[PDB]
Write a protein that binds this ligand. Structure first.
Ligand code: CU
Ligand code: CU
Lengths: 128, 128
């Protein structure tokens, strides 16, 4: 779309895209996450989290450690540019962030921090 | 080991072996599963399930559909040759099955049926 993208996370532990291109003229950008599956949040919760590629590993590792009540994200984690909540089946959530937090030339990764899901639920985002 | 194998499943959704060999001379075979990790059963529970390569997908789909209370395995599923319980961090379980249930020149697969894990947590078993 233009300054929005719709993404789904499913019961097979995958996202329906692995690359998001943010257009340089967007003042803000929205990610709409919907979970069309059947499994509950405590076993297959998904969220969409954005960080630079170099920070992804620490966000996932510290996320895993904060637990389900913290939506597997370290509270006030400085490395996280934007994130949705951790949702379960049949739920939807959206996040809008300011594009000026991104800079051209940096590799960004989006991913799910529910334990083990980043193996498959990850993609690139780049401001072009 | 003689007619037995000790196998580990970890918080990164990996088993420590991806190929089990069963000797035809064995009357029985035992699989001893341990989880040395730290994540609980509802978020990273692992089990070890055996079926033919042909029935694995049906066992996985129906398993997913049975729910956490049924250890993500259909009750009395004819296709499951042997399986452990679904266990979490710090636990261990063993299954011993008769080698007469395996036929020479049939491909078998072992896998974890916890939602999302079988595409990564799987390996081959063969009768030699
Ligand atoms: Cu997820
Ligand atoms: Cu598992």
């Amino acid at each position: 779309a233009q300054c929005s993208v719709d993404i789904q996370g499913n019961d097979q532990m995958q996202f329906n895209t692995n690359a998001i291109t943010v257009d340089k003229s967007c003042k803000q950008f929205t990610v709409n996450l919907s979970l069309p599956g059947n499994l509950p949040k405590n076993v297959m919760g998904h969220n969409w989290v954005l960080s630079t590629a170099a920070d992804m590993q620490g966000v996932v590792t510290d996320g895993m450690a904060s637990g389900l009540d913290k939506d597997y994200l370290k509270p006030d984690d400085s490395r996280v540019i934007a994130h949705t909540k951790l949702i379960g089946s049949g739920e939807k959530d959206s996040v809008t962030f300011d594009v000026s937090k991104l800079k051209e030339g940096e590799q960004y990764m989006f991913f799910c921090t529910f334990p083990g899901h980043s193996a498959l639920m990850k993609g690139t985002l780049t401001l072009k």
